Amino acid sequence: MPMQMFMQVYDEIQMFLLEELELKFDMDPNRVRYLRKMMDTTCLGGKYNRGLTVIDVAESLLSLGARRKRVLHDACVCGWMIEFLQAHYLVEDDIMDPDVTVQCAINDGLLLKSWTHMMAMHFFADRPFLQDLLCRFNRVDYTTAVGQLYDVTSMFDFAEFTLSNYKRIVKYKTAYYTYLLPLVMGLIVSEALPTVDMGVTEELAMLMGEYFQVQDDVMDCFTPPERLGKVGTDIQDAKCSWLAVTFLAKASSAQVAEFKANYGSGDSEKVATVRRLYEEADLQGDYVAYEAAVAEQVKELIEKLRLCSPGFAASVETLWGKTY
Template sequence: FLQAHYLVEDDIMDGSVMRRGKPCWYRFPGVTTQCAINDGIILKSWTQIMAWHYFADRPFLKDLLCLFQKVDYATAIGQMYDVTSMCDSNKLDPEVAQPMTTDFAEFTPAVYKRIVKYKTTFYTYLLPLVMGLLVSEAAASVEMNLVERVAHLIGEYFQVQDDVMDCFTPPEQLGKVGTDIEDAKCSWLAVTFLGKANAAQVAEFKANYGDKDPAKVAVVKRLYSEANLQAD
């Protein structure tokens, strides 16, 4: 339920079209954006309802509910990092509160890892691992710092793969339409490219990144291919 909540809300924030081969929930016939937002809230509320229903008399319930809150908070912070990673407060369009231009100062490995840690790894990997340990009452027998470290490493590996597929995998195979370039996301591809490109390539990248014009998107993909990022 919690993952479904994040996906519903994330699709709305990103203006996504497809999710796993089907229209995003907010784009389904008869489902308005307002209804989809509320549906996402309902999905999240079910996590605690289900926990109380099945584990009301179990000693780990408090820790489980605390875990849900921790993951929910961390993921919300991650979403904020994701949507503001390109944002310069001095360059905001007051009408839409979105960045009009950027110097790409936030496109660094450290910022990228921070986004991935909070946006992806907490709910995708840390949550199920720690839930399993709590429900099996084995949490006391493991080093939780190590569990968190492993979860974050797996999450980072997953997100790098996801970023590459978003750019290079056809929508019919990916199950969604990749829009990281159009949305000016701080992706692994963008960060890695800026770290290895020459001045002319960087200038061409900055002139085309974050634009929905298919011709400009094609330029960015060409730059990525020329840099052989898929081999990295």
């Protein structure tokens, strides 16, 4: 039922957005169908983990009937706001890596983000939480752009190749919008935001984001493209990855010199040299121990949350199960 409900609400939001363009923005049918296809291509096809998390949080807070139906519908619209925000970031990432295709990609980026506001302003028009929801969503979106700056400039200004900076990148670039925002939106629609310890929740979101990114980083380097679903390019791109920061703390002066001469290059042999250095430093072994310690911290904080917010902690437990 969650997925069938989420997809039903997508059809509803899409028809509202396209009809609004046709009836209030003077859009011609050719462009309406063009935007319908663009919206489907960019917003559909993923796992919907962020969107479905909003639904799971709302259901936990109503259980633990005009209010119920409304809360779950609101949870679905919030869920699509996050999925459209994610769609916006991917289009922006695709531009990053008189051409009407580039003009249309930039335009797509702007529309996807504007659509998060348009769907909120319509579906939550009479809701008292509209202002707070808009403010928290905008602040998380800003946080994400700041994280993108930290990420893209990490190898410029290896001084920033530290674990504390790696955590700063993960927190801002990924954790706030992927883990914290779905949790917060589920609380807003349930009118249950002041009933939870925000400190422990923020801390949980950061830890889950860190656990996911460390796993993502190790897989980017060692999981082959057919199994990974993409070509891993962190070494070539000279990313501030968990592997790079962990390697620098434990390598010898000549090994660091070898890492520095070979990192951030497209050359096949230089990438292989970096992989060889990670392997010889036993980084895959260290990966298992790092993740276990993060998991111990996550499991502990959920208990603290359950003391005052039981239903919420159970939805945080489900979100964690999807990451672990």
